């Protein structure tokens, strides 16, 4: 029936922000009941026309508003209109229930009319101007923008973001690109690059806060991602150029900030690793060159500088770079490259000097002779030496030198604190192979055996600088003794050689007692007692004839004796004059290097014979690879040596 | 009954008479109203002529 003149005033009043009395409301809803009594598909069109007319009138009311005045119109009206639509929903909820082939949906679609109306452009411009002012620093309330965002999101068929996207997202992002691109250029032109990273981080945090503050979360990713394009990726070249600049000078905090800023992008960390390795290598070589010749003959200085640079870069990578596996791998590779072969090695025409000097540095460090013993700090130095030794490609030289040096040290009573030595040997056993420990533990046990045996001679003397150390010479790295009969003054002591060691079933070390009466004043000097032994005889040339020792070593003894004042006195009785011969050091070093080379040659021969024990006959392409992968732990061989060994084995009729 | 099976199969079963289907098919293989009464009424199996 024609009772349409009652819903009119109802919606007109509900269109206002003032509430409506519930008592009289039955006059409206019940009237809708009359419509569906005694369908029709006629009311939808009439209500659509009414909504269109009301919305057109509302648009005409405030058409001219803009420049923050429109923004107070759309938002102001939408709250009231949404409340009115929600209230009216229940009026025709009956139809909405029984009409499915939508009143709130119709209201939203009609709202789309004013949305796509001239209001769209000016409203979007005002919103973007508000964002721009917020970026500048001026504070503005964010309630109205939240209302506008809710307006843009709600429209649709988070049900659908198509209209919201097409109407706000593209233009917001475009404004962002132009703003950031415009500002970054002259900011970098005038302001320093060091604080650019901090400003970028602060800006990114500001956007990441704004998005939840007064924006839909659906744009969480895109807004961030493209904002990396304008800020970070587009300016990657200047960042790369300045990485070296601000890495040369300690800026570790800036290093961490830069790493955090640049890690967001895809494949951004890779390039900086190259520069890191290059700079580490260059700085290491520069430091080694600055050390120069002094580094070659002074292991302490060279190893100290190497450990200092290693510690500095290790701390830097562990702190700034958050302990990334790629970064530590790059550091390890650079350390290997610039510590295996460097300037100091070039003077020795060999790459084995760097590992060799480490053994001498260790021996000097843990020696109790120089000034004094150090505890609670020597352990850290030993651990750092272990760390730096982990890199060494040629580990055979270190072990070979250390075995001989430890044997020489432990033959005499000279030894540092037992705790540090025990820790060092335990660490070496844990890190190195069994074969070396099987040899070192033999010395460790045999010295205790000798210590226990020492009392036997004293007790035998009682029953019937004096401690005869006895240990089997078969397995230790030493050499034979010279031919020189002991004089009468010392003959009686060794005449009682029989003991458990001998009764049950070497001497080339000049030791003796200091009792001389030839000179007017007596002295007490422990030294190489070859001169002391010769003194028992007494011309200058007469001494050699009676002793008839081999001319080479005897002449060397004479020269070293003449170096002193004994033959042609000191401040105190504490005098040693026990300087080791210079030539013997170089001769022994050359001999041990030759022995190591021979041992490696024999090892590679045995290794090829063993690997072919499982391979009947095969090619050469995989032979070298299998050889290297089976011997990578120790010093790696050289191709010509392998070829010569293979030729010799072929001559041996082993393979084909 | 093995000797004779009622064509319908129960009232007057003996009188009605004169796998059960196989036994009864002898007469049919080598017609009347009320065919669509028992569940056995179906043209899937060959029962013509």
């Amino acid at each position: 029936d024609q009772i349409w003149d009652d819903l009119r005033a109802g919606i007109q009043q509900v269109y206002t922000r003032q509430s409506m009395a519930k008592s009289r409301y039955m006059e409206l809803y019940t009237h809708v009941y009359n419509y569906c009594t005694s369908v029709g598909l006629e009311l939808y069109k009439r209500l659509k026309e009414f909504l269109k007319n009301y919305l057109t009138n509302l648009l005409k009311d405030g058409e001219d508003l803009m420049d923050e005045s429109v923004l107070k119109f759309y938002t102001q009206q939408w709250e009231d209109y949404r409340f009115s639509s929600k209230v009216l929903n229940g009026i025709c909820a009956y139809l909405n229930r029984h009409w499915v082939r939508e009143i709130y949906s119709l209201a939203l679609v009609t709202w789309r009319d004013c949305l796509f109306r001239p209001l769209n452009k000016q409203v979007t411009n005002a919103v973007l101007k508000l964002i721009e002012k917020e970026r500048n620093g001026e504070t503005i309330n964010t309630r109205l923008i939240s209302g506008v965002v809710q307006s843009y999101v709600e429209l649709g068929l988070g049900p659908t973001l198509t209209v919201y996207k097409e109407s706000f997202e593209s233009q917001f992002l475009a404004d962002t690109e132009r703003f950031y691109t415009r500002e970054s250029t002259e900011f970098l032109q005038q302001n320093p690059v060091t604080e650019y990273m901090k400003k970028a981080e602060a800006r990114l945090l500001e956007e990441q806060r704004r998005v939840q503050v007064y924006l839909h979360e659906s744009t969480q990713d895109e807004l961030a991602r493209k904002c990396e394009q304008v800020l970070i990726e587009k300016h990657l070249e200047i960042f790369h150029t300045e990485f070296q600049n601000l890495l040369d000078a300690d800026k570790n905090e800036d290093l961490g900030r830069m790493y955090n800023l640049v890690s967001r992008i895809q494949d951004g960390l890779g390039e900086l690793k190259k520069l890191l390795e290059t700079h580490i290598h260059n700085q290491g070589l520069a430091a080694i060159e600055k050390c120069g010749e002094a580094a070659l003959n002074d292991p302490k200085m060279y190893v100290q500088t190497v450990l200092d640079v290693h510690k500095k870069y290790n701390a830097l990578v562990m702190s700034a770079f958050n302990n990334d596996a790629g970064f530590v791998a790059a550091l390890d590779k650079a350390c290997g490259r610039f510590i295996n072969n460097n300037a100091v090695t070039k003077m020795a025409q060999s790459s084995s000097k760097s590992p060799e000097l480490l053994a001498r540095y260790c021996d000097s460090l843990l020696k109790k002779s120089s000034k004094n013993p150090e505890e609670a700090e020597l352990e850290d130095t030993l651990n750092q030496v272990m760390v730096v030794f982990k890199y060494i490609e040629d580990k055979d030289v270190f072990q070979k030198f250390y075995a001989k040096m430890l044997a020489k040290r432990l033959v005499h009573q000279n030894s540092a604190s037992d705790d540090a030595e025990a820790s060092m040997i335990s660490k070496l056993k844990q890190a190195c192979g069994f074969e070396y420990t099987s040899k070192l533990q033999r010395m460790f046990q045999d010295i205790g055996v000798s210590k226990d045996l020492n009392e036997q001679f004293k007790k035998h003397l009682t029953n019937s600088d004096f401690s005869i150390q006895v240990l089997s010479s078969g397995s230790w790295p030493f050499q034979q003794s010279c031919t020189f009969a002991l004089p009468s003054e010392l003959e009686r002591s060794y005449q009682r050689f029989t003991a458990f060691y001998a009764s049950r079933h070497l001497y080339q070390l000049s030791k003796g007692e200091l009792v001389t009466n030839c000179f007017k004043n007596r002295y007490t000097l422990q030294a190489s007692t070859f001169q002391m032994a010769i003194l028992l005889q007494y011309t200058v040339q007469q001494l050699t004839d009676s002793t008839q020792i081999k001319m080479d070593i005897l002449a060397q003894v004479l020269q070293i004796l003449l170096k002193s004042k004994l033959l042609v006195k000191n401040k105190k009785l504490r005098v040693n004059i026990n300087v080791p011969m210079k030539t013997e050091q170089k001769q022994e070093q050359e001999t041990t290097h030759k022995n190591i080379e021979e041992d490696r040659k024999l090892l590679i021969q045995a290794a090829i014979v063993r690997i072919m024990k499982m391979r009947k006959v095969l090619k050469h392409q995989q032979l070298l690879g299998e050889v290297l992968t089976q011997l990578s732990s120790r010093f790696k061989p050289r191709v010509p040596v392998i070829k010569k060994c293979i030729d010799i084995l072929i001559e041996k009729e082993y393979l084909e | 009954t093995l000797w004779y099976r009622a064509p319908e199969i129960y009232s007057t079963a003996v009188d009605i008479w004169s796998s059960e289907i196989d036994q009864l098919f002898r007469i049919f293989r080598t017609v009347w109203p009320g065919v669509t009464s028992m569940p056995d009424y179906k043209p899937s199996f060959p029962k013509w002529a």
Binding site: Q469, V470, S473, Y501, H505, Y507, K511 | -
Partner: protein, 37 residues
């Protein structure tokens, strides 16, 4: 007088590398230790 001394075996086994290899090539099974390698 404090110095170092040593004691060594008696019967012992030792041979040159070339002779060692030649002996290993055919004597690996003839005796059971105490005279080889």
């Amino acid at each position: 007088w404090n110095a170092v001394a040593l004691w060594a075996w008696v019967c012992n086994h030792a041979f040159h590398f070339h002779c060692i290899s030649r002996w290993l090539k055919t004597r690996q099974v003839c005796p059971l230790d105490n005279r080889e390698w």
